[PDB]
Symmetry: C3
Amino acid sequence: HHVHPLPDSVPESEDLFAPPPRMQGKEGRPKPHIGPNYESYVKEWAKTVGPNSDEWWAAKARETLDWYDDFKTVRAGGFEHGDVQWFPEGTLNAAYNCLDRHYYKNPKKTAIIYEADEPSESREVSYEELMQETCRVANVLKSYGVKKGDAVSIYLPMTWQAAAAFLACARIGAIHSAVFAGFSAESLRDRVNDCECKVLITTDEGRRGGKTIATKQIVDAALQQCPLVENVLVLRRTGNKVPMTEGRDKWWDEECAKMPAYCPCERMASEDPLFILYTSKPKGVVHSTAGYLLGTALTLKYVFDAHPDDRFACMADIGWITGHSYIIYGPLANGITTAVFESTPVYPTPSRYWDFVDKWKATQLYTAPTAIRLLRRMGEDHVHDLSSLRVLGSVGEPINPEAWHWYNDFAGKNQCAIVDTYWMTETGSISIAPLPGAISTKPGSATFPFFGMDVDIIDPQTGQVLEGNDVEGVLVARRPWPSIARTVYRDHKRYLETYMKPYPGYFFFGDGAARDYDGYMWIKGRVDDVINVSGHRLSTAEVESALILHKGVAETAVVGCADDLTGQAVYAFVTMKPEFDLKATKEADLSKELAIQVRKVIGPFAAPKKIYLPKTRSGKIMRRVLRKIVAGEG
Amino acid sequence: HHVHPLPDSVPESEDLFAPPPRMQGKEGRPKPHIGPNYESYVKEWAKTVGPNSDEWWAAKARETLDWYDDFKTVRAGGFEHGDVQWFPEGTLNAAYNCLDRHYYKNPKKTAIIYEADEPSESREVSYEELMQETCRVANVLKSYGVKKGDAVSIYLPMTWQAAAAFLACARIGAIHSAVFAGFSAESLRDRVNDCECKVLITTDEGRRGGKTIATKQIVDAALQQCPLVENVLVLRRTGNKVPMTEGRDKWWDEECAKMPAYCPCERMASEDPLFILYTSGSTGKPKGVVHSTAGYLLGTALTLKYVFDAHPDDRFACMADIGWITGHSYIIYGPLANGITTAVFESTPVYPTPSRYWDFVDKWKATQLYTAPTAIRLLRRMGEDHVKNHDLSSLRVLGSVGEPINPEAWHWYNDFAGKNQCAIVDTYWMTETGSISIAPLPGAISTKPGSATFPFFGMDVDIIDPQTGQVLEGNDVEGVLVARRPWPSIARTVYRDHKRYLETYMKPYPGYFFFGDGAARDYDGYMWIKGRVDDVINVSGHRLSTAEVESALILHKGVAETAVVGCADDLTGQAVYAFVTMKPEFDLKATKEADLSKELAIQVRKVIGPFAAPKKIYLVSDLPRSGKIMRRVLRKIVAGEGADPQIVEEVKQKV
Amino acid sequence: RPKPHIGPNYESYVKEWAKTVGPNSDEWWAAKARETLDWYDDFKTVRAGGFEHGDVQWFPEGTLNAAYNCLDRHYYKNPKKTAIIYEADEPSESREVSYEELMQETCRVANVLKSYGVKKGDAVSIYLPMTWQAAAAFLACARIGAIHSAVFAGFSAESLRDRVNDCECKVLITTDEGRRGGKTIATKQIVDAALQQCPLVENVLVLRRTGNKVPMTEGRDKWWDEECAKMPAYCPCERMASEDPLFILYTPKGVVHSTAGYLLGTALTLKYVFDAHPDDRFACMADIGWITGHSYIIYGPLANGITTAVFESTPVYPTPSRYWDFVDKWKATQLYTAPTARRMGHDLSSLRVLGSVPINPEAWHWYNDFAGKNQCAIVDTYWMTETGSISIAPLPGAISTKPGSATFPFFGMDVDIIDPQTGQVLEGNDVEGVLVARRPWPSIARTVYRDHKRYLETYMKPYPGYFFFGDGAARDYDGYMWI
Ligand SMILES: CCNS(=O)(=O)NC[C@H]1O[C@@H](n2cnc3c(N)ncnc32)[C@H](O)[C@@H]1O
Ligand SMILES: CCNS(=O)(=O)NC[C@H]1O[C@@H](n2cnc3c(N)ncnc32)[C@H](O)[C@@H]1O
Ligand SMILES: [Cl-]
C-alpha cells in the first residue's frame, strides 16, 4: 500500500475495533442513534451531502432547534466570495435553545456539573439556576447600553459563571469574544482592541490546580492600552483583595442583585454573528447563529451518541473552540448535563479525571492528546470503576497510536468506543470522526467525515484531486457546511486568501491527510510543518510517532532547516520521561538509537540529521519557534 | 363567630345586597358576563387557578389581545427569585391593543370623554384623534433619540393628552414613568433621577378645582438637579407665560405639527417592561414598581371586563388620576384595551360645586363610576342636596378603591349615587398587583358593606397566622393576606432594586406574595381587608384595625371622617387615640365638645369593646395626594414629634 | 412576443380597474400585495387613514425588506441572471452585472454602514452618478432599514449642503469623479466644499469610478473597495414594517415614502404599464437622483426580477443614435425617456412598449413609427415625486390609445379636476381645471421630512380632503386626460 498508518508497535491486523456492547443496545444502555455498522453510517450520511440533501438539513434544523420565525431557504452562497448562508430567513436565540426551553420542561435538571479546583467545592448548577444567572447578567449588560451586534470581551477562568456570561451576550444579540484566562495582557489587549468592545467581563482571580490566576491584575494592565473599554464586570471568584477602579469596574454580584431574574430573548436572524474567537495580527474567527448551533447540537448527539440522561464531561477550556462547542453550546442545546472543570488533570492527583468520572457517573469523556501524555506517562495505578463511561473522545492534534490503546484498555475496559475528532476553530464543529455505534475504529485515525462534510484529497504538487483510496495530499472540503466560520472579523480578505484561494473551488483546512485502502482518513499535521528531504515530503506526525516508540521518550517535535545537499533536513527536539537515566544512556548514544528507530520505521530519508518543548497555552507545540532558532534568528 | 364584619348600623341579616335589576339584564341593560349567582363565579374562577388553569389563560390571552407573534409557554418562574414570566415567546404592542385595532374598527367611536376643570371646555376625543396624537408624540420622542427600553418621565395633569403620552411611549417601546402633577420638585427630582430618563413630558400649567398648578415652574426647579435630562416636551395647556430654556425645552404643539400622524408599532416581547410607577412608599427612597407588557395588559383588560361588567358601548368614568395605578389600569390601559369610552376627569368632586360627579354622570350618561372612599366621605359631608336632584339612572356599577370603605359611606354610595339600583364593587388591590385582586363580580355576587368578597380570576389568596407562619384552613379565620401563586399582572421587579422587591414581598412569607394587609375570611367565605399590618393597634392583647374603629365612630350622627392611631400605654401596651372631623351642619354648641366625645367612645365600646374605645378624642377640621390619610403623621404628633402643611400645624394645636 | 397581462379590449381593463377602486378595493390590493412581494410577517389591515390629517397607512402589520425583494429572492432562484446592464459612458466599458454580483456588493456596503454605527431609521445621503454601484448603495441602506437620501450628482455644493443637513444623515456615499456625455463630473470636489458646513456627517465612503487623484480627509474619508474588502458578502435583512420610511427625495422639500406601499406601486406599474415579463430588458434613461430613477431603474425592475439598465451617458454621445445602438446591442424590450428626447438628425424589433415622462403630440407619431415601426405600443406617463409610482398611463395590450392623452389613470388611482374659483369638482367629461386625486393609493408619499406641516399646507389643505397635484389638467368626451 502507498498510504501507511502512523507508526505503532501493534500489528495492523489487530488494530480494527468494532463498537463494543456498551455501544450496542445491550447492558441496559441506550441503543446508538446510528448503527450498528459502517453501512448504517453511510446510509444516513448520503442524505446529508449532494444535490438532494436540503430535505435532510431542513428537517434536522426544524427538529433540533426552536425558531421564532421559520426559514424558507436552506442554503446559499459559497467559498469564492464568502457569502455562506444557512436558513437565512429564520430567527432564533441561542440562549433560548440552550436554557429557556429546557427550563420550561425540567427546571431542576442539572445543566452544569461545576467541578471546582478543590473537589469539595464542587456542586451541580441546574437549568433554573443557570438561566436566572444568565438573565441577570444580560440585564446588567443592557443597563451598560450594550445593543444587538455589540462586541463584549470575556476573560473568565473555568468557573461555571463563564457559561452564563457567554449566554448573556447571546441572549441580547451581543457578540461575545472569549479570551483564555491566562493570556498575557499583551494578548488580552490585542484581542480587546481588535473587536472594539466597550464592555469586559472577568473575575477577581482564578484557581487552577491550586495556583492563583491574577485575572483582575492582568486586566488592569491590559486595559491601560485598551482605550474603548468603559465597563468591567468582575465576578467575585476568590474574594481576595484586588484593585477595583472606581466607576469603570463593578462587582458581578452587586450589579446582578439589582436586576430581575428574567430577561427577554433578542430574536436573532440565522446569520447574525454569535461570537468572535481569536486564534494564536490576531485572527478573529466569526461564527453566525443558526448553523453553528445546529452543527454543535448534531455533532454532540451523533459523534458522542448523547441521550437525554447523559452527563457529558469535556475537560477543555471555554477560552478555546472546543469549550465553546462541546462544553456550552452543544451540550446545553441538547439539554443534557455538561461539566465545567476548573482544575488540571494532575490535581489533587493524576486520578482526578477518574475520581471525577466515578463521582459523577460521567457518560462521555473528551480531552486532548497533550493531556493524554500525562496519564499514560505517570502511571496506570491512577486508573477506579469508570464503568459509566461509554464513549471516549480525543481532540486537538494527532494522537500517537500508543496513547490510543491505553485509552481503550484502562479508561474504557475495552468497552468504550474511542472517537478521534478532527476539526478546526474555522469549521465550528467536528469534521471527521467515527460514530461510536457504527464505525469500527483504527488507532490514530479520524475515520470518516461527519454529516454535511464532503471532503477530498488534493496533490499539492499538481493542485488536482486524487480520485480513489490509498492516496495522500492535503485535505479540502467540496461544499460549505452549516457551522463554517463566516468571516474573519473586519478582515474578510484574510479569510478568503487563507481558506478559499489556495485551491479554488474548495475549502483548504491546512492539514496534510491521507485516505487509506479502507477509506479511513488520516490527519498527519500542518502543511506548513512538512519537511522535504531530497524530494521526500515528510509529515511531522509520522516522525514524531516513530520517536515515541523508543523507551523513555515522552514528547517530540521535528522541524525542518535548509540543507545544501538534501534541501531540508529533519531536526528532532526530544523530551524524556523523568525517571529515564541520561547517564546510562548517553545523550550521544540516545540519538544513535533514535535515528536508527526512525530509519527502521520510516526510512533512511527520514533519519533526523540532529536530535536535541515551547508550547502555547492551548497545548500546541510552537514548531515555528524551533524552526527559526535552528536557522539562527534569535 | 370569631370574625366580625366592619361595624355597621344595619343588622347583619339585612346587610346582604343581591345584584339589582340593572345587573340582571333588565331595564334594557346588557346581561352580565358572569351570573346570575355565586355559583356562576366559582365555576369560572376554578378554571383560572390550580395546576390545570393554563388552558383558560392561554385562551383568554389570545381572545383579549392582538399579538404580532403567538406565545408557546403560558407561565414560568415564581416568587422566590423574582423571575415571573407570562406568555414569554409572544410579541405585541400596548398602543396597538389600546388604539390601532379599535381605530381600524370604529375610528369615530369616542375613546376619551375629556371633562375639563371648567365644564364648558369638555369634549369627546375619538379613537382616531387620540391615535393621531399618540403617533405624533411617538415620532417626536424618536426624533429625540428615544429607543426601545429607555425611560421617559411624565409630569402631566389630568388632560386627555396624558393618555397620548403614555401610549406614545408604549408604541415605541419606551418605559413611561408617570409622576403625579402636584408633587414637589423634590419628589419629582428623585423620580426623574432614579429612572435615569433623558426626556420629560409636562405642561406649562395645570388646572384643578379652579387653581393653577405651576408644573413648568416646579419642573425647572427639579431639573436644576437632574443632570441626565436632555429634552422636555411642554404641552400648551393654559398659554400663560412660563420660562422655557432654549434648546432643552420645546412646545408639544410645535414639535408634533412637524411629524406624521402615523407611526409604526414596536414589536415588544411580552416581558419587556411597559412602565415604572414610583410610590412614596415604605421609607427612604422611592420605590419604582415595574410592570411588563402582556400580563399587565391582559390583567387590566380582564378585570375591567368582569369586575365592572364592561360592554362595548359603555362609558366608563374612573375619577382617579393617571399619576396613580388606578389611573394607569382603569382610566387608560384597561378601558382603551377593551375598546370602550373612558373618562379623563380634570376637576375635583367639589368644583364648581359638590354636584360635579353627578352633573358629569348625567351630562355624559356614564354607565360605571369608580372613585375612592375619601371622596365618598367628602361628598357625604357636604350634603344630599347636591346628589338628590339628579337622574343617575345610566349607572349600573359603582366602584370603590384605595382603602377599606366604612359601611356608612358604603350605604351613602349605594343609596344616593346608585339609588339602591346599582351594584357596588369594592376593589382591593395594590400598585404591585397591576390589576384588581379581590372584588365582587357585579352580576353574580351579593355584596356586604365593607367587604371585597372573593378573589378575581387567577388570584388564589390565603390567610396566614403571622405567629405560626401557617395557612389557616377554613372560614372565620383572621391574619395577614397572601397569594399562593403568581398571577399575570404582578409587578416584575423594583427598578434597579430587585433586592428590595424580593425582601419586601417574597421573603416575609417564603412561598407566597405578602400584600402587607391584615385580612379575615368570615363564615360565608367573604374576605375582609381591614388595613395595613403596620397600622395595627394592640390594646391589652386585642389587635385592632384602624378600619373597624373608624367604621364604628362614623356610625354616630354628624361624623364625616375619622382617623385613629395608637399611642404607647404603660398598662395596656397601646391605646386608641381618635381624630374626628364633623359635618358642617352639626352644631358644636348644642352638643358640647366633651359630651360628643363620650357618645363616640360609648359607640365604639358597644360595637367593638372598651379596649377599642378611644382614650382621647381630638376634634379637628381636616386630616392630613393619592387620597390616603397620613396616619403616620398623626401617630408621630400624638407621640411628640416636629399635601397641605397647614393641617399639620392645626393638629399640633389641638393636641 | 409574450401575451400582455391585460387585454385585448377595454372590457378587460374595466373588469380589472374596477377592482383597484371602490368598496372591495381592499380585497384586490390584498391579493396583489401577497402575490407580488415576499413578506417576513403577514399584514392584517389593507388600508387606513386618509388625506385629511396625513395618516396614510397600507399593510401596517406586515413586515418585509426592499433588498430581499429586489435581490435575495431572485438570487436564490437564478443567481447568474443579469440584474443590471451597466452602459458606461464609454460604450466598450459596458458589462452585465448579475443578481449574485449585485447582491454581494449590496451586502458588503450594508456591512460597512453597520461598522459606522448606522442604525435602523438613520439617514444616509447618496451623492452618486449613474454608475451601477448606485443601486447597491440604495439597497444597502434599505437592507439595514436605513433611510437613503439620493442627491443628484450634478447638484451644486450648496444644494447638497442643504439636502444633507435637512435629513441629518451621519454618513455620505459618493464617487471620486463622474462620467457623462464624455465629460467629467467632479463629485468629491463638490462633496468636500459642501461638507465644510455639514457638522453631523462623520463618515464618507468614496467609490473609485476613475482612480484620479482626489482629496481624502483622513479619518472621515475611506475607499469603498478597501472598506468592502474587509466585510463579508452576506448581510442579514432588517425586518421592516410596511410604514417604516424607505427614502427621502428632496424636490428642500424631502418627500418621504414608506416601504411596502412604494414598493408595491413600483412593482405593479412596471408589470402592467410597460407589460414587463421575466426575460425582458427594461431600459430607463433617467437618473437615480430623481424619482424616475428610484422607481423605474432600481425598485420597480429589480422587484419583478427582470433586467434593468443603468445608462451612464447622454442621448447624443457619441452620436444621436446611442438609444438605438443601445436598443439593438442589448435587445432592449422597453424604452423610457424624457420629453427633451428627431432634431439632431437600426433593427429595434426587440422593443415592444415605449413610454415618455408633457410631450408635443407629433412626437407621439414619430415615437410610434421611427422608433416603433407601427408595431410597438405607446404608453404616456405623468406623475411626480409625491406619487411614488406613475399615476396616469394607458395599459398597452388592451386599450386603444390616442396621441397626447393617457386613456385612464393607473390601477388604484381615481383623479378629478376642481374649478380653482368655486372649489367644486367639475363632474362629467369635456371639462378643465386643476388636477387633484380622490382616495389614497399605496405608493402615495407619506409626509415631508420633519415638515408634515408643509405636507398638509401644499397638497392637503389647498382643497379639502383631496390631493392637490399643483398642475392644470383637462378631460374630454373620450375620458382622456391632458396636462
Ligand atoms: C478544534 C480544535 N482546535 S485546536 O485544538 O486548536 N487544534 C489545532 C489544530 O490541530 C488540528 N487538529 C485538530 N484536531 C485534530 C485531530 N484530532 N487530529 C489531527 N489534527 C487535529 C487542526 O488543524 C486544528 O486547527
Ligand atoms: C389599588 C389601590 N391603590 S392605593 O390607592 O395606593 N391604595 C393603598 C393601599 O391600600 C390597600 N387597599 C386598596 N384598596 C383597598 C380596599 N378596597 N380595601 C382595603 N384595602 C385596600 C392596598 O394595600 C393598597 O396598596
Ligand atoms: Cl471503538
